[PDB]
Amino acid sequence: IPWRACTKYLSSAGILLLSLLVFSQLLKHMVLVAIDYWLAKWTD
């Protein structure tokens, strides 16, 4: 299945929520890695 079906599916949502979802997911994963990255320096 091409990217066109998903493109139409997400464009029915609009530009309002697409970025609000994608950047929030990116930031959540960045926090989930950064907590352990800081714990690494916490250890010693």
């Binding site: 907590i35 352990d36 714990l39 690494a40 250890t43």
Partner: protein, 538 residues
Amino acid sequence: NGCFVDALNVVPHVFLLFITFPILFIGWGSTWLHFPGHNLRWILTFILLFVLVCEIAEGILSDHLHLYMPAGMAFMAAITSVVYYHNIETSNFPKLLIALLIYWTLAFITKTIKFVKFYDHLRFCLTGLLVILYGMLLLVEVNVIRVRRYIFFKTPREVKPPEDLQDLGVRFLQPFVNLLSKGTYWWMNAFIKTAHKKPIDLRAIGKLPIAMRALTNYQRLCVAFDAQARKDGARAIWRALCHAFGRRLILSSTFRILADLLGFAGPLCIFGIVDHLGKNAYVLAVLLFLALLLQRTFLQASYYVAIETGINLRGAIQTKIYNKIMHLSTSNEMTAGQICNLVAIDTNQLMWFFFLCPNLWAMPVQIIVGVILLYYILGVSALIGAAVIILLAPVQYFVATKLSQAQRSTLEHSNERLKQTNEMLRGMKLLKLYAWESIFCSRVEVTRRKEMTSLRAFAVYTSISIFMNTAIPIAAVLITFVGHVSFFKESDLSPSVAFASLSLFHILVTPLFLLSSVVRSTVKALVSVQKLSEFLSS
């Protein structure tokens, strides 16, 4: 004369590795014959692989090439014995077996000499384990010749290789392959590669072996039901299924528990490595590699054996309740719908519960080993953390139940909507002949809003589930590490402790979710088997 005995041990591996190459290159340049002790032989060969890895670790710790060459030679010797037994299973011979037996005997002799010269004065345990494994393989070979016609009188009275899984076209050959591929599913390479090009269909698909049909499972189930009813119900049918499906289920369950043990074991060797470098680690790394691969392989074999037992059970009880459909009386519309739900939802519930059966036995030991292991790494504080994660498991269940309730309500509305559609898509010409269509579309949209309203609460519960899923892992580490160092004893938390706790937290979060679904599936299956018993006995 240590190096002398080392060379004396190196010799026989060279002998076998040199005899194997002509025959291996002849074979490299469709009937599967299996011999008694094949599975035992492959198990012992994998144990040999492990012990040879340990010997290589010893040789690295000691270093002197001639002092650790025997392990590297026996490695290729065992691999070539595997290739030999593959070439014998693909084409039987009374002479290649003797060629293996000679090598087994010579290796046993050399190991005995090593043991004696060591007793006259870590090596001890590995040498003893190798001796025992080679002796058991020798006994397997002796059993094979005792059963075969290698040196026995004129004719072997061969087995006439089984036509159960090798006769007229069959494609799903699970029971009839090498016990390594029975684990790693190597026989699927050909199927999947052919499937990439040509579209699969029932003509391109196989036919089920005699080991698993409607007739076979029905026969076993009716034999158990007969042996239980001749001694005369819900408990009766239950015990009948239990005694009928027997060994396969418990085999899957024990595969599963051993895999769970090794999975709990991984992070501890991680911890050991982290300790060693901050203050004997390559060995721990290769052991971690081996333990990971073995644990996951056993987990997967467990899954598959359970799934196959479940599919057997579904076929069996389906053909059984169809056999019952023939003798029922006409006095018993609603019963037809109840019958077809008894096959569409009740049987699927039964079979999926039989999927999840071994998980219900393997979950408690997993959480117990997890909590006891984390306690000895983090102390009293660990206990506190060990509570929080566990507290997510009942809560999850509660959440799930709410979902179900919501689902029910939503379904109701949905059904009604469909009705209000079926009219419009039939009186099409009537509808458009006077353009009353918008008037009905208003009503259809009125139903839709109610449907939307239900969906909000359902998705709120879904959001709460997804939120807890990744919130409890964070909260455990938060309230544990903050509550360990800056609260209780100010103990210096080495990186090993924290990272082992992290690993164990994930390895314990993964199974926790499954217990809730397991409990729901089990109670639903109990109700469905009560229903099946009420029906099957009318």
